[PDB]
Amino acid sequence: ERPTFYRQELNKTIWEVPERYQNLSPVGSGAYGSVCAAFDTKTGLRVAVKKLSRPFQSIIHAKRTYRELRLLKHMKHENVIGLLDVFTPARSLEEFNDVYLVTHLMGADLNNIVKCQKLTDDHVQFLIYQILRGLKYIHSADIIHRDLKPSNLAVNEDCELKILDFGVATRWYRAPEIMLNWMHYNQTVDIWSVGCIMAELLTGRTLFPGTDHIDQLKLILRLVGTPGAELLKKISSESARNYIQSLTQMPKMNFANVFIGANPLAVDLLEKMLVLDSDKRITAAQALAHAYFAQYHDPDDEPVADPYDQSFESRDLLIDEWKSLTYDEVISFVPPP
Numbered sequence: 001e002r003p004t005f006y007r008q009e010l011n012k013t014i015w016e017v018p019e020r021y022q023n024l025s026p027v028g029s030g031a032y033g034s035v036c037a038a039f040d041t042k043t044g045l046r047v048a049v050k051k052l053s054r055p056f057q058s059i060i061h062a063k064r065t066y067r068e069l070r071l072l073k074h075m076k077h078e079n080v081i082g083l084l085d086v087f088t089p090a091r092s093l094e095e096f097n098d099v100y101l102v103t104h105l106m107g108a109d110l111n112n113i114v115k116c117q118k119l120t121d122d123h124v125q126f127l128i129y130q131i132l133r134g135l136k137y138i139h140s141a142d143i144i145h146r147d148l149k150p151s152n153l154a155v156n157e158d159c160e161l162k163i164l165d166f167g168v169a170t171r172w173y174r175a176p177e178i179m180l181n182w183m184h185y186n187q188t189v190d191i192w193s194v195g196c197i198m199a200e201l202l203t204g205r206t207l208f209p210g211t212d213h214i215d216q217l218k219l220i221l222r223l224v225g226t227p228g229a230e231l232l233k234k235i236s237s238e239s240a241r242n243y244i245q246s247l248t249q250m251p252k253m254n255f256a257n258v259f260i261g262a263n264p265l266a267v268d269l270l271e272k273m274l275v276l277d278s279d280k281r282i283t284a285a286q287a288l289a290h291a292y293f294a295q296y297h298d299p300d301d302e303p304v305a306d307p308y309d310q311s312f313e314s315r316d317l318l319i320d321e322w323k324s325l326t327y328d329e330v331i332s333f334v335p336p337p
């Protein structure tokens with residue numbers, strides 16, 4: 001019943017993988033671990049195989065390993081990275097030391113598809129629609145991505161897009177409240193990021209290319225105005241209020257005069273995404289119903305996720321406990337259809 005494994009030296013460690021995975025070729029390495037491209041002879045798919053580095057070295061490593069495996073096992077959606085396989089050469093918990101994760105091999109990310117050129121409006125609709133479709137799903141599991149950017153968006157040769165948890169400055173796509181360490185984030189932090197991405201795809205230019213942390217905020221407030229009276233009512237920070245109070249007011253710009261020549265429906269959606277007040281930003285579900293996506297929207301096929309039990313985040317367990325829980329998750333894995 002156990003697959004036959006083989007051993008091969010790869011990124012200067014011995015990999016031990018099921019024989020179904022052929023022709024491993026290193027493609028990436030870092031603190032996280034190392035990744036090889038491979039061909040899965042069982043499915044006929046090109047896949048990425050990641051060997052976790054030091055997955056049980058410490059309590060923190062072990063809880064991170066568990067977290068990553070739980071998250072990948074949960075995500076089952078066309079526009080979100082999912083798990084094709086997870087395996088260990090270990091024949092028991094006693095010998096369990098290594099964790100390998102398998103997903104679709106992804107060629108390129110959103111940066112590659114755009115490469116500083118305007119996309120057509122039809123192409124923007126399709127790409128943003130997919131991102132929002134995956135976000136509706138992620139957000140329905142009560143998960144916030146928090147670091148949505150082009151490098152975290154994989155796109156194949158059929159223009160099919162998947163949201164990733166890994167890969168320019170990251171800061172360019174971050175919501176202002178995250179830049180200010182606000183610490184009670186709305187899921188619409190991700191909608192901010194989507195707005196930044198959409199604007200760049202339409203114009204071929206980064207919307208808010210800040211040079212440093214404060215510059216990023218400066219460029220943001222120039223577009224969306226300084227905080228209104230309704231927003232200021234909601235700021236508990238004495239230091240923030242007093243600073244904002246001191247600021248010479250700027251109105252919000254008219255996006256129609258900013259995104260010259262764009263589809264007016266695109267402009268309208270951007271206005272709804274890039275609102276300073278996070279409580280007033282459009283949600284992923286609401287955005288999917290916006291007229292901009294008329295050619296793609298289908299309420300019958302914009303699914304939500306099963307509830308995701310994140311109670312483990314609150315727990316302080318020992319290495320061997322996190323390891324045992326991770327082993328349970330490896331053993332219980334059922335590959336997708």
Ligand SMILES: C=CC(=O)Nc1ccc2c(Nc3cc[nH]n3)nc(-c3ccccc3)nc2c1
Pocket residue numbers: 027028030032035048049050101102103105106165166167
């Ligand atoms: C700060 C942490 C960090 O950057 N972590 C990374 C980085 C790259 C990952 C990766 N890269 C690639 C390359 C081609 N496909 N996947 N692939 C994978 C991956 C590979 C197989 C299954 C699940 C994830 N994970 C990566 C995790």
Ligand SMILES: CCCCCCCCO[C@@H]1O[C@H](CO)[C@@H](O)[C@H](O)[C@H]1O
Pocket residue numbers: 176177180182183184185186217221227231234244276277278279
């Ligand atoms: C001068 C810089 C002003 C930045 C203002 C960003 C306001 C973001 O919006 C705020 O997000 C918080 C969640 O993080 C919510 O609790 C608040 O209700 C909401 O108004």
